[PDB]
């Protein structure tokens, strides 16, 4: 499995679960730019970490 396939599968599994709003998740985006998935929300942050 490639990175894109893993990302798609992970996003699909993650999407169903509820996600409480967390104020700090936005200013981090600006910084790193590793370019490992389109910048978004917690859902992508979690996917990249995994």
């Amino acid at each position: 499995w490639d990175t894109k396939t893993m990302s798609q599968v992970a996003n699909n599994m993650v999407d169903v679960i509820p996600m409480e709003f967390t104020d700090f998740i936005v200013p981090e985006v600006n910084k790193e730019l590793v370019f490992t998935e389109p910048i978004q929300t917690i859902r992508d942050a979690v996917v990249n970490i995994l």
Binding site: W1, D2, T5, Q8, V9, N12, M13
Partner: protein
């Protein structure tokens, strides 16, 4: 080139207006083969063997594609031919660099021999010729395949057992390859790869 010029003329009796192009197709076919045989040698992987039988599977596949297809245009003929070339030559390749170089080789070959105006991306995932949704074998749209496989696979899991699997674009590609295998008269398939990656299901 002579043998296959005869084969192309025979099969283009079904599409007689395009008979003139039988020469460049045959020449393209052997040229691709030679460079394939040259650049992907057995020194990379021991299963990289290429006989002239690769071209004979090719023409029979192209035949079948034409026989069970709709009205073609030259753009369609080239797309179809690209699909066949993909499923013959490149499925055995490992390494994304090898598939990318195969794309480059394909573009060069067609540019050399069939210089037409409306070819688009020739990526393996951009030319989903299907025979499932439609009665006749033709290049169908990715969205509709997705929705069809989702609903049918849901139905399959409801009717059979409880396995949770999420559809993804590689899965639908491999589905189409297996369909292509199983619909041949004597198609035997071999699925190399890792564990936990859906083969047996």
């Amino acid at each position: 080139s002579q043998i296959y010029e005869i084969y192309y003329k025979a099969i283009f009796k079904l599409v007689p207006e395009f008979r003139s192009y039988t020469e460049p197709f045959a020449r393209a076919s052997v040229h691709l083969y030679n460079e394939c045989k040259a650049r992907y040698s057995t020194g990379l992987q021991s299963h990289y063997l290429f006989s002239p039988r690769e071209l004979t599977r090719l023409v029979r596949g192209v035949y079948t594609a034409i026989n069970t297809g709709p009205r073609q245009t030259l753009r369609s003929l080239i797309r179809l031919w690209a699909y066949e070339a993909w499923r013959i030559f490149a499925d055995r390749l490992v390494g994304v660099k090898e598939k990318n170089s195969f794309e480059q080789l394909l573009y060069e070959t067609v540019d050399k021999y069939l210089p037409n105006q409306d070819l688009g991306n020739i990526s393996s995932t951009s030319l989903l010729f299907s025979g499932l949704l439609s009665l006749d074998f033709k290049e169908v749209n990715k969205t509709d395949l997705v929705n069809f496989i989702e609903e049918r696979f849901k139905t399959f899991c409801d009717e059979e057992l409880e396995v949770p699997m999420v559809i993804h674009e590689s899965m639908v590609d491999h589905i189409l390859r297996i369909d292509r295998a199983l619909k041949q008269v004597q198609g035997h398939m071999m699925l190399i790869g890792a564990s936990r990656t859906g083969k047996t299901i």
